[PDB]
Structure 1
Amino acid sequence: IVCHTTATSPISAVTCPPGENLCYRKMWCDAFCSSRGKVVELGCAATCPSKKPYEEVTCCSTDKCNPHPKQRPG
């Protein structure tokens, strides 16, 4: 229940202090992108404070939660 998991076993461990979220999966850009993947910087938070219209991913309920791996109806 931390920053970057990835599905399985070694991960879900130690990155930032205790609680929810930690490094939020917050989408976006701020001033500049011109980039491809496309989606997400990172922080140390446990809250979700800004975030309404255009707009961002959230507070994690879970290990990763996550953007944008994201494929097709398959």
Structure 2
Amino acid sequence: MRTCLISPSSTPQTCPNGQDICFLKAQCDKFCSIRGPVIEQGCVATCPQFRSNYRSLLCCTTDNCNH
């Protein structure tokens, strides 16, 4: 069913079977002071658990909602 925006181009793509949630994740690694968070967009079966190094995490259930 679901189509989501995918990294790195933020282009809409069909989700793999069993993954009906779109996500947008901004996470800081050891290099956040050099280049800021890495942005990841994709499909998931379950909204990921929030981590202490996430600037933000959006999970949503409308097509291409993860922007």
Q: Which protein has greater RCO, CA pairs closer than 8 Å, 6+ apart?
A: 2
TM-score, with structure 2 as normaliser: 0.48
TM-score, with structure 1 as normaliser: 0.45
Structure with the bigger percentage of helix: 2
Computing the radius of gyration over CA atoms, which structure comes out larger, 1 or 2?
A: 1
